[PDB]
Amino acid sequence: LSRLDKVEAEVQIDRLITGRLQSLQTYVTQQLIRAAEIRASANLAATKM
Amino acid sequence: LSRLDKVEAEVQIDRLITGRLQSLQTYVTQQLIRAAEIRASANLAATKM
Amino acid sequence: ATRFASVYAWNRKRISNCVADYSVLYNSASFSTFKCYGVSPTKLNDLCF
Amino acid sequence: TNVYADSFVIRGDEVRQIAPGQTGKIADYNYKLPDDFTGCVIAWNSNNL
């Protein structure tokens, strides 16, 4: 922001949006899968209890 | 399509292609995880039956 | 300067330890082209190199 | 729904300075076209006029 202006600062910020949104989406996908794994483990633990 | 002709129009259309592919892929990933959860639930239900 | 260097022997000078003002240079009359990369012409008055 | 026609005269060197989102004295001090501009810029040399 402190170097460019809107017309092209937006061009760069859009690249950063793409990158960071992709990273956060990957993290959330991994967390969903891991949470499903933990759900299976907790169901097993409850059955064992 | 009704405003931009070909070369300057594809530059914008591909943006929608990327966005909507990302959205549809997110939807399909969520559905895969949810269907795995329902698979586990159905297996439990069949065992209970 | 009275004489600009030849491209065959282009001249180079270094600027350090001073306070600048690029607004007066950007808007001055004689300048046919004043174009920047990686920084905006209006923004130069708020960075410190 | 409506069209706006803006008419003026300018130096030939300065016809490079009228494009939307562009920078320069004729833009920031006389007549600025926004980033959301949708239209057409038209110009022609006018010696005899």
UniProtKB/Swiss-Prot annotation, chain C:
- Tell me what effect the entry lists for S28F: In strain: Omicron/BA.2, Omicron/BA.2.12.1, Omicron/BA.2.75, Omicron/BA.4, Omicron/BA.5, Omicron/BQ.1.1, Omicron/XBB.1.5, Omicron/EG.5.1
Q: Which domain of life is it from?
A: Viruses
Upon changing S32F, the result is: In strain: Omicron/BA.1, Omicron/BA.2, Omicron/BA.2.12.1, Omicron/BA.2.75, Omicron/BA.4, Omicron/BA.5, Omicron/BQ.1.1, Omicron/XBB.1.5, Omicron/EG.5.1
Q: What does this protein do?
A: Attaches the virion to the cell membrane by interacting with host receptor, initiating the infection. The major receptor is host ACE2. When S2/S2' has been cleaved, binding to the receptor triggers direct fusion at the cell membrane. When S2/S2' has not been cleaved, binding to the receptor results in internalization of the virus by endocytosis using host TFRC and GRM2 and leading to fusion of the virion membrane with the host endosomal membrane. Alternatively, may use NRP1/NRP2 and integrin as entry receptors.
| Subunit details | Binds to host ACE2. RBD also interacts with the N-linked glycan on 'Asn-90' of ACE2. Cleavage of S generates a polybasic C-terminal sequence on S1 that binds to host Neuropilin-1 (NRP1) and Neuropilin-2 (NRP2) receptors. Interacts with host integrin alpha-5/beta-1 (ITGA5:ITGB1) and with ACE2 in complex with integrin alpha-5/beta-1 (ITGA5:ITGB1). May interact via cytoplasmic c-terminus with M protein. May interact (via N-terminus) with host bilirubin and biliverdin, thereby preventing antibody binding to the SARS-CoV-2 spike NTD via an allosteric mechanism.
The molecule here is called: Spike protein S1
Q: Which organism is it from?
A: Severe acute respiratory syndrome coronavirus 2 (2019-nCoV)
Give the organism's phylogenetic lineage: Viruses, Riboviria, Orthornavirae, Pisuviricota, Pisoniviricetes
Q: What is the covered span of the full protein?
A: 344 to 392 of 1273
